[PDB]
Design a protein around this motif. Structure first.
Motif, mmCIF file in Angstrom:
data_model
loop_
_atom_site.group_PDB
_atom_site.id
_atom_site.type_symbol
_atom_site.label_atom_id
_atom_site.label_comp_id
_atom_site.label_asym_id
_atom_site.label_seq_id
_atom_site.Cartn_x
_atom_site.Cartn_y
_atom_site.Cartn_z
ATOM 1 N N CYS A 23 45.518 24.443 49.041
ATOM 2 C CA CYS A 23 44.903 25.131 50.165
ATOM 3 C C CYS A 23 43.375 25.271 50.033
ATOM 4 C CB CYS A 23 45.495 26.515 50.363
ATOM 5 S SG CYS A 23 47.191 26.437 50.986
ATOM 6 N N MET A 24 42.860 25.531 48.833
ATOM 7 C CA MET A 24 41.389 25.565 48.630
ATOM 8 C C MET A 24 40.758 24.256 49.129
ATOM 9 S SD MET A 24 39.985 27.375 45.207
ATOM 10 C CE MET A 24 41.123 26.742 43.998
ATOM 11 N N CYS A 27 41.096 23.969 52.854
ATOM 12 C CA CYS A 27 40.095 24.895 53.447
ATOM 13 C C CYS A 27 38.665 24.343 53.375
ATOM 14 C CB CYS A 27 40.136 26.278 52.785
ATOM 15 S SG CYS A 27 39.110 27.507 53.644
ATOM 16 N N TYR A 28 38.263 23.906 52.188
ATOM 17 C CA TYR A 28 36.908 23.400 52.022
ATOM 18 C C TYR A 28 36.631 22.210 52.963
ATOM 19 C CZ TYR A 28 32.856 21.230 49.727
ATOM 20 O OH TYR A 28 31.648 20.636 49.418
ATOM 21 N N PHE A 33 42.986 26.959 57.341
ATOM 22 C CA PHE A 33 44.021 27.290 56.381
ATOM 23 C C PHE A 33 45.347 26.766 56.925
ATOM 24 C CE2 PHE A 33 47.134 30.529 54.696
ATOM 25 C CZ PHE A 33 47.026 30.181 53.360
ATOM 26 N N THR A 118 41.915 32.912 42.838
ATOM 27 C CA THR A 118 42.278 32.637 44.219
ATOM 28 C C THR A 118 42.972 33.860 44.849
ATOM 29 O OG1 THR A 118 44.443 31.780 43.445
ATOM 30 C CG2 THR A 118 42.627 30.178 43.642
ATOM 31 N N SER A 158 41.368 31.164 50.580
ATOM 32 C CA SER A 158 41.512 30.074 51.528
ATOM 33 C C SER A 158 41.988 30.617 52.873
ATOM 34 C CB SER A 158 42.507 29.043 50.996
ATOM 35 O OG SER A 158 41.921 28.368 49.902
ATOM 36 N N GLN A 161 38.874 32.246 54.213
ATOM 37 C CA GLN A 161 37.796 31.311 53.922
ATOM 38 C C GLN A 161 36.695 31.870 53.000
ATOM 39 O OE1 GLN A 161 37.009 28.112 56.805
ATOM 40 N NE2 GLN A 161 38.431 29.104 58.261
ATOM 41 N N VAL A 164 35.059 30.059 49.655
ATOM 42 C CA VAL A 164 35.631 28.696 49.390
ATOM 43 C C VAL A 164 34.507 27.676 49.252
ATOM 44 C CG1 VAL A 164 37.139 26.799 50.136
ATOM 45 C CG2 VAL A 164 37.932 29.150 50.376
#
Ligand SMILES: Nc1nc2c(ncn2[C@@H]2O[C@H](COP(=O)(O)OP(=O)(O)O)[C@@H](O)[C@H]2O)c(=O)[nH]1
Ligand SMILES: [Mg+2]
Length: 178
Positions: A23-24, A27-28, A33, A118, A158, A161, A164
């Motif tokens: 998910c990171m 997200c990035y 997400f 996280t 994430s 946000q 991130v």
């Protein structure tokens, strides 16, 4: 010239299953997400990203645990690791010491690390905090960073946000600065 971007940075994300590595990365890269399907491993992904005076070619490698007692190809050529644990999992924090630091010392001795806590949205939730006696604080997260020799510690979510972008911006900056 024939190439305005001359630096490639291989950034490998590692840490216990279910802490939020994939998910990171989603997200990035996507500013979103995932709410339904989440893959085991994010696609190998590479893109130009602007950091300070510079545009660099960032390569993101996601990972997943294997029962493998041979004593990982994904680590080859790594310039920096993002080593993730969940801010609400003590086992994942302890595994940074027991599993991940030993692994990285053996397989990637000179490669720097950005330590990432996280699920900040959970750790910072006052409801969560009210029911738990022994929370992973930013202080404990910083103490871990110190013990393992990591370059930086960042807490992120994430889900909201928060921080991130800071994770991967910092990964890049660690590699580019002396
Ligand atoms: N609340 C919250 N849940 C998250 C966050 N990041 C990931 N998750 C959830 O944690 C579980 C594991 O996420 P995943 O990215 O697949 O973890 P990975 O195994 O380390 O790749 C999933 O149900 C995600 O929805 C976050 O920042 N906040
Ligand atoms: Mg994953």
């Amino acid at each position: 010239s024939h190439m305005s971007v001359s630096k490639f940075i291989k950034c490998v994300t590692v840490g216990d299953g279910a802490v939020g590595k994939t998910c990171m990365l989603i997200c990035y890269t996507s500013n979103k997400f995932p709410t339904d399907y989440i893959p085991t491993v994010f696609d190998n992904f590479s893109a130009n990203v602007a950091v300070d005076g510079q545009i660099v070619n960032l390569g993101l490698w996601d990972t997943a645990g294997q029962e493998d007692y041979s004593r990982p190809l994904s680590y080859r050529g790594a310039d920096i690791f993002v080593l993730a644990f969940s801010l609400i999992s003590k086992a994942s924090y302890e595994n940074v010491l027991k599993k991940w630091m030993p692994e990285l010392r053996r397989f990637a001795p000179n490669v720097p690390i950005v330590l990432v806590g996280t699920k900040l949205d959970l750790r910072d939730d006052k409801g969560y905090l009210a029911d738990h006696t022994n929370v992973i604080t930013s202080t404990q997260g910083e103490e871990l960073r110190k013990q393992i020799g990591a370059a930086a510690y960042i807490e992120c979510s994430s889900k909201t946000q928060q921080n991130v972008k800071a994770v991967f911006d910092t990964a890049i900056k660690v590699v580019l600065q002396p």
